[PDB]
Amino acid sequence: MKKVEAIIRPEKLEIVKKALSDAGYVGMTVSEVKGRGVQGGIVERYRGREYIVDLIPKVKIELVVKEEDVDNVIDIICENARTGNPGDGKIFVIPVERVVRVRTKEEGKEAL
Amino acid sequence: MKKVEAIIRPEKLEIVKKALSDAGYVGMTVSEVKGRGVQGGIVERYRGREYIVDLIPKVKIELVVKEEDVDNVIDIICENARTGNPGDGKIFVIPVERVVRVRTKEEGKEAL
Amino acid sequence: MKKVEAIIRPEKLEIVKKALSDAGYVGMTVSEVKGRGVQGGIVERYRGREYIVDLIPKVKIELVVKEEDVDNVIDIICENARTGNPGDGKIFVIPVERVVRVRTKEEGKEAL
Ligand SMILES: Nc1ncnc2c1ncn2[C@@H]1O[C@H](COP(=O)(O)OP(=O)(O)OP(=O)(O)O)[C@@H](O)[C@H]1O
Ligand SMILES: Nc1ncnc2c1ncn2[C@@H]1O[C@H](COP(=O)(O)OP(=O)(O)OP(=O)(O)O)[C@@H](O)[C@H]1O
Ligand SMILES: Nc1ncnc2c1ncn2[C@@H]1O[C@H](COP(=O)(O)OP(=O)(O)OP(=O)(O)O)[C@@H](O)[C@H]1O
Ligand SMILES: O=C(O)CCC(=O)C(=O)O
Ligand SMILES: O=C(O)CCC(=O)C(=O)O
Ligand SMILES: O=C(O)CCC(=O)C(=O)O
Ligand SMILES: [Mg+2]
Ligand SMILES: [Mg+2]
Ligand SMILES: [Mg+2]
């Protein structure tokens, strides 16, 4: 099992989660975050002066899935989250050693 | 060292954190999140029409602990977070390779 | 690749992120959290009575970096986040097995 952690534009949550759900990837945790990447933020202008805004709102989605499904999850996220402009997102894959469903104490792949 | 990441009902935070603390599991980070599991959300009715609400508020708790304590932490969370209805929670165990206390630069088990 | 996850005082975000950026560590995700450590919270007094506040606001910063840079990232965070009083922060290092830039589908170290 692996956690796919993707930080994406807030306005892309709806299309990404629909595309994931349609492909069978339903279990997901969503968090509001702020961040920056390589570019260090965005340049804005106020009264003729340019300045850097160095933290931008994003949404973090976390999906724990079987390892064999990671490629497809990443492909779906990238296809649907992309706009072509810097800031479209970053994905990390993090190992998950155990998964437990609280209600039933099921573990493993059936507990996803 | 392992991170126990549990996503549970918001109204179960108090009883879960009390039970963990009573058993000696104190260090914890709490985050407000939204999510869905297998069921894909909840069915609601508005003016006779049923629709799906596909993200539900939850609370994420993260406890970094010694590996030997993971079983007990999971047992405590499940016992106290359960209600018997879908949505009671999901737990992931994620490896933690290093722990550092900022104030003192202590590392390892004593830094938990 | 490794995720450095640091939970620090909210009022230290600015100096920590500036120091990290100055040293070349730019990519970062920031989350608002609450937590407690060893001390279990803070003692407060209201109308002569002392009570425990057991969750304190903090900021979580997450930086995914090359393994060889983890030591330096931790050193920078600790130097700039410390005040000398309990609550200055906790850092966890979590393995990251894959990194993908959404816009370009780049992976690996160049996608950081
Ligand atoms: N190395 C990293 N560590 C932590 N979070 C990161 C990192 N890289 C990016 N992020 C998070 O991902 C979000 C989106 O990053 P972003 O798309 O800007 O990446 P990028 O590498 O700059 O690529 P692009 O050139 O397409 O902008 C950031 O706002 C931040 O929350
Ligand atoms: N595979 C998963 N990946 C990411 N987060 C998940 C996943 N499964 C569940 N979650 C998170 O855990 C929360 C609680 O899940 P939930 O209890 O509904 O799990 P479930 O597998 O549907 O079990 P149940 O049948 O008891 O509802 C979700 O709202 C979501 O935040
Ligand atoms: N073992 C842990 N698991 C989860 N989160 C933790 C843990 N230890 C600390 N944290 C998080 O880090 C924050 C800061 O912790 P803190 O600085 O109080 O650590 P500490 O071990 O008590 O050290 P100090 O004695 O310097 O206070 C907490 O409020 C919490 O969010
Ligand atoms: O996040 C944005 O929308 C643009 C800024 C960006 O790509 C960054 O800081 O890396
Ligand atoms: O989270 C709820 O309370 C019920 C909905 C649920 O279990 C889910 O989407 O998996
Ligand atoms: O977080 C604080 O500022 C002090 C309380 C503390 O260190 C703790 O609960 O461990
Ligand atoms: Mg960018
Ligand atoms: Mg469910
Ligand atoms: Mg403390």
JSON list of C-alpha atoms in Angstrom, two decimals, chain B:
[
{"chain": "B", "resi": 1, "resn": "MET", "atom": "CA", "xyz": [9.44, 4.91, 14.94]},
{"chain": "B", "resi": 2, "resn": "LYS", "atom": "CA", "xyz": [6.08, 4.99, 13.18]},
{"chain": "B", "resi": 3, "resn": "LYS", "atom": "CA", "xyz": [3.44, 7.58, 12.48]},
{"chain": "B", "resi": 4, "resn": "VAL", "atom": "CA", "xyz": [-0.10, 6.45, 13.28]},
{"chain": "B", "resi": 5, "resn": "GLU", "atom": "CA", "xyz": [-2.36, 8.65, 11.16]},
{"chain": "B", "resi": 6, "resn": "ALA", "atom": "CA", "xyz": [-6.03, 8.25, 12.03]},
{"chain": "B", "resi": 7, "resn": "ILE", "atom": "CA", "xyz": [-8.92, 10.02, 10.37]},
{"chain": "B", "resi": 8, "resn": "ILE", "atom": "CA", "xyz": [-11.93, 9.96, 12.71]},
{"chain": "B", "resi": 9, "resn": "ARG", "atom": "CA", "xyz": [-15.24, 11.67, 13.41]},
{"chain": "B", "resi": 10, "resn": "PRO", "atom": "CA", "xyz": [-14.76, 15.20, 14.80]},
{"chain": "B", "resi": 11, "resn": "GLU", "atom": "CA", "xyz": [-16.98, 14.46, 17.81]},
{"chain": "B", "resi": 12, "resn": "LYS", "atom": "CA", "xyz": [-14.73, 11.54, 18.77]},
{"chain": "B", "resi": 13, "resn": "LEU", "atom": "CA", "xyz": [-11.56, 13.62, 19.17]},
{"chain": "B", "resi": 14, "resn": "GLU", "atom": "CA", "xyz": [-12.13, 14.29, 22.85]},
{"chain": "B", "resi": 15, "resn": "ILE", "atom": "CA", "xyz": [-12.68, 10.69, 23.97]},
{"chain": "B", "resi": 16, "resn": "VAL", "atom": "CA", "xyz": [-9.93, 9.33, 21.72]},
{"chain": "B", "resi": 17, "resn": "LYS", "atom": "CA", "xyz": [-7.29, 11.85, 22.86]},
{"chain": "B", "resi": 18, "resn": "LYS", "atom": "CA", "xyz": [-8.22, 11.32, 26.50]},
{"chain": "B", "resi": 19, "resn": "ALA", "atom": "CA", "xyz": [-7.92, 7.54, 26.13]},
{"chain": "B", "resi": 20, "resn": "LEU", "atom": "CA", "xyz": [-4.58, 7.84, 24.32]},
{"chain": "B", "resi": 21, "resn": "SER", "atom": "CA", "xyz": [-3.19, 10.28, 26.89]},
{"chain": "B", "resi": 22, "resn": "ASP", "atom": "CA", "xyz": [-4.33, 8.05, 29.76]},
{"chain": "B", "resi": 23, "resn": "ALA", "atom": "CA", "xyz": [-2.38, 5.17, 28.22]},
{"chain": "B", "resi": 24, "resn": "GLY", "atom": "CA", "xyz": [0.76, 7.31, 27.85]},
{"chain": "B", "resi": 25, "resn": "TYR", "atom": "CA", "xyz": [0.38, 8.41, 24.21]},
{"chain": "B", "resi": 26, "resn": "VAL", "atom": "CA", "xyz": [0.50, 12.20, 24.43]},
{"chain": "B", "resi": 27, "resn": "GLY", "atom": "CA", "xyz": [2.44, 13.65, 21.50]},
{"chain": "B", "resi": 28, "resn": "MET", "atom": "CA", "xyz": [-0.09, 14.36, 18.77]},
{"chain": "B", "resi": 29, "resn": "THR", "atom": "CA", "xyz": [-0.85, 16.67, 15.84]},
{"chain": "B", "resi": 30, "resn": "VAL", "atom": "CA", "xyz": [-4.48, 17.38, 14.93]},
{"chain": "B", "resi": 31, "resn": "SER", "atom": "CA", "xyz": [-5.73, 18.65, 11.56]},
{"chain": "B", "resi": 32, "resn": "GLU", "atom": "CA", "xyz": [-9.19, 19.47, 10.20]},
{"chain": "B", "resi": 33, "resn": "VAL", "atom": "CA", "xyz": [-9.87, 17.59, 6.96]},
{"chain": "B", "resi": 34, "resn": "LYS", "atom": "CA", "xyz": [-12.73, 16.37, 4.78]},
{"chain": "B", "resi": 35, "resn": "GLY", "atom": "CA", "xyz": [-12.95, 12.95, 3.19]},
{"chain": "B", "resi": 36, "resn": "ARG", "atom": "CA", "xyz": [-14.86, 9.94, 2.02]},
{"chain": "B", "resi": 37, "resn": "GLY", "atom": "CA", "xyz": [-14.35, 6.22, 2.14]},
{"chain": "B", "resi": 38, "resn": "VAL", "atom": "CA", "xyz": [-15.87, 3.18, 0.40]},
{"chain": "B", "resi": 39, "resn": "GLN", "atom": "CA", "xyz": [-19.36, 4.58, 0.52]},
{"chain": "B", "resi": 40, "resn": "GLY", "atom": "CA", "xyz": [-18.39, 7.72, -1.37]},
{"chain": "B", "resi": 41, "resn": "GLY", "atom": "CA", "xyz": [-20.13, 10.10, 0.97]},
{"chain": "B", "resi": 42, "resn": "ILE", "atom": "CA", "xyz": [-23.59, 10.33, 2.45]},
{"chain": "B", "resi": 43, "resn": "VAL", "atom": "CA", "xyz": [-27.03, 10.44, 0.88]},
{"chain": "B", "resi": 44, "resn": "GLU", "atom": "CA", "xyz": [-29.05, 13.51, 1.85]},
{"chain": "B", "resi": 45, "resn": "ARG", "atom": "CA", "xyz": [-32.56, 14.57, 0.89]},
{"chain": "B", "resi": 46, "resn": "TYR", "atom": "CA", "xyz": [-33.62, 18.12, 0.05]},
{"chain": "B", "resi": 47, "resn": "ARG", "atom": "CA", "xyz": [-37.22, 18.83, -0.93]},
{"chain": "B", "resi": 48, "resn": "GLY", "atom": "CA", "xyz": [-37.88, 15.18, -1.78]},
{"chain": "B", "resi": 49, "resn": "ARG", "atom": "CA", "xyz": [-34.74, 14.71, -3.85]},
{"chain": "B", "resi": 50, "resn": "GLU", "atom": "CA", "xyz": [-31.83, 12.54, -2.77]},
{"chain": "B", "resi": 51, "resn": "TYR", "atom": "CA", "xyz": [-28.29, 13.59, -3.61]},
{"chain": "B", "resi": 52, "resn": "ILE", "atom": "CA", "xyz": [-24.76, 12.59, -2.56]},
{"chain": "B", "resi": 53, "resn": "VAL", "atom": "CA", "xyz": [-22.55, 14.73, -0.37]},
{"chain": "B", "resi": 54, "resn": "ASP", "atom": "CA", "xyz": [-19.17, 13.29, -1.30]},
{"chain": "B", "resi": 55, "resn": "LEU", "atom": "CA", "xyz": [-16.82, 14.94, 1.23]},
{"chain": "B", "resi": 56, "resn": "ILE", "atom": "CA", "xyz": [-17.53, 14.74, 4.97]},
{"chain": "B", "resi": 57, "resn": "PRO", "atom": "CA", "xyz": [-15.72, 16.69, 7.74]},
{"chain": "B", "resi": 58, "resn": "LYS", "atom": "CA", "xyz": [-13.27, 14.60, 9.75]},
{"chain": "B", "resi": 59, "resn": "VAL", "atom": "CA", "xyz": [-10.36, 15.16, 12.12]},
{"chain": "B", "resi": 60, "resn": "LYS", "atom": "CA", "xyz": [-6.91, 13.75, 11.39]},
{"chain": "B", "resi": 61, "resn": "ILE", "atom": "CA", "xyz": [-4.77, 12.81, 14.37]},
{"chain": "B", "resi": 62, "resn": "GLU", "atom": "CA", "xyz": [-1.10, 11.93, 13.94]},
{"chain": "B", "resi": 63, "resn": "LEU", "atom": "CA", "xyz": [0.90, 10.24, 16.72]},
{"chain": "B", "resi": 64, "resn": "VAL", "atom": "CA", "xyz": [4.56, 9.33, 16.22]},
{"chain": "B", "resi": 65, "resn": "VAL", "atom": "CA", "xyz": [5.45, 6.44, 18.52]},
{"chain": "B", "resi": 66, "resn": "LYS", "atom": "CA", "xyz": [7.84, 3.53, 18.94]},
{"chain": "B", "resi": 67, "resn": "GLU", "atom": "CA", "xyz": [7.00, 0.63, 16.64]},
{"chain": "B", "resi": 68, "resn": "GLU", "atom": "CA", "xyz": [6.26, -1.65, 19.59]},
{"chain": "B", "resi": 69, "resn": "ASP", "atom": "CA", "xyz": [3.41, 0.69, 20.66]},
{"chain": "B", "resi": 70, "resn": "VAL", "atom": "CA", "xyz": [1.56, 0.85, 17.32]},
{"chain": "B", "resi": 71, "resn": "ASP", "atom": "CA", "xyz": [-0.72, -2.12, 18.06]},
{"chain": "B", "resi": 72, "resn": "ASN", "atom": "CA", "xyz": [-1.85, -0.60, 21.35]},
{"chain": "B", "resi": 73, "resn": "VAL", "atom": "CA", "xyz": [-2.36, 2.87, 19.84]},
{"chain": "B", "resi": 74, "resn": "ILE", "atom": "CA", "xyz": [-4.50, 1.39, 17.07]},
{"chain": "B", "resi": 75, "resn": "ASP", "atom": "CA", "xyz": [-6.48, -0.65, 19.57]},
{"chain": "B", "resi": 76, "resn": "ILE", "atom": "CA", "xyz": [-7.20, 2.43, 21.71]},
{"chain": "B", "resi": 77, "resn": "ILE", "atom": "CA", "xyz": [-8.23, 4.53, 18.72]},
{"chain": "B", "resi": 78, "resn": "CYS", "atom": "CA", "xyz": [-10.53, 1.86, 17.33]},
{"chain": "B", "resi": 79, "resn": "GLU", "atom": "CA", "xyz": [-12.18, 1.13, 20.69]},
{"chain": "B", "resi": 80, "resn": "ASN", "atom": "CA", "xyz": [-12.93, 4.79, 21.37]},
{"chain": "B", "resi": 81, "resn": "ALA", "atom": "CA", "xyz": [-13.61, 6.11, 17.87]},
{"chain": "B", "resi": 82, "resn": "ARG", "atom": "CA", "xyz": [-16.06, 3.38, 16.82]},
{"chain": "B", "resi": 83, "resn": "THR", "atom": "CA", "xyz": [-19.82, 3.96, 16.66]},
{"chain": "B", "resi": 84, "resn": "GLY", "atom": "CA", "xyz": [-20.83, 1.04, 14.44]},
{"chain": "B", "resi": 85, "resn": "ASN", "atom": "CA", "xyz": [-21.85, 3.16, 11.47]},
{"chain": "B", "resi": 86, "resn": "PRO", "atom": "CA", "xyz": [-19.82, 3.68, 8.30]},
{"chain": "B", "resi": 87, "resn": "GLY", "atom": "CA", "xyz": [-17.49, 6.65, 8.60]},
{"chain": "B", "resi": 88, "resn": "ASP", "atom": "CA", "xyz": [-15.89, 5.79, 11.95]},
{"chain": "B", "resi": 89, "resn": "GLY", "atom": "CA", "xyz": [-12.41, 6.14, 10.54]},
{"chain": "B", "resi": 90, "resn": "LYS", "atom": "CA", "xyz": [-9.32, 4.90, 8.77]},
{"chain": "B", "resi": 91, "resn": "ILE", "atom": "CA", "xyz": [-5.82, 4.44, 10.16]},
{"chain": "B", "resi": 92, "resn": "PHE", "atom": "CA", "xyz": [-2.56, 4.41, 8.24]},
{"chain": "B", "resi": 93, "resn": "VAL", "atom": "CA", "xyz": [0.86, 3.49, 9.65]},
{"chain": "B", "resi": 94, "resn": "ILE", "atom": "CA", "xyz": [3.70, 5.38, 7.95]},
{"chain": "B", "resi": 95, "resn": "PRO", "atom": "CA", "xyz": [7.43, 4.86, 8.68]},
{"chain": "B", "resi": 96, "resn": "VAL", "atom": "CA", "xyz": [9.31, 7.69, 10.38]},
{"chain": "B", "resi": 97, "resn": "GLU", "atom": "CA", "xyz": [13.08, 7.50, 9.87]},
{"chain": "B", "resi": 98, "resn": "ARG", "atom": "CA", "xyz": [14.16, 10.36, 12.18]},
{"chain": "B", "resi": 99, "resn": "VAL", "atom": "CA", "xyz": [12.59, 12.42, 14.98]},
{"chain": "B", "resi": 100, "resn": "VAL", "atom": "CA", "xyz": [14.14, 15.68, 16.25]},
{"chain": "B", "resi": 101, "resn": "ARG", "atom": "CA", "xyz": [13.01, 17.92, 19.12]},
{"chain": "B", "resi": 102, "resn": "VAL", "atom": "CA", "xyz": [13.58, 21.52, 18.01]},
{"chain": "B", "resi": 103, "resn": "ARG", "atom": "CA", "xyz": [14.32, 23.07, 21.39]},
{"chain": "B", "resi": 104, "resn": "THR", "atom": "CA", "xyz": [17.08, 20.68, 22.47]},
{"chain": "B", "resi": 105, "resn": "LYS", "atom": "CA", "xyz": [18.22, 18.96, 19.25]},
{"chain": "B", "resi": 106, "resn": "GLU", "atom": "CA", "xyz": [17.47, 15.60, 20.87]},
{"chain": "B", "resi": 107, "resn": "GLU", "atom": "CA", "xyz": [16.74, 12.79, 18.40]},
{"chain": "B", "resi": 108, "resn": "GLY", "atom": "CA", "xyz": [15.40, 9.28, 18.50]},
{"chain": "B", "resi": 109, "resn": "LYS", "atom": "CA", "xyz": [13.06, 7.66, 20.99]},
{"chain": "B", "resi": 110, "resn": "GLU", "atom": "CA", "xyz": [13.79, 10.23, 23.70]},
{"chain": "B", "resi": 111, "resn": "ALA", "atom": "CA", "xyz": [12.64, 12.98, 21.31]},
{"chain": "B", "resi": 112, "resn": "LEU", "atom": "CA", "xyz": [9.15, 11.53, 20.88]}
]
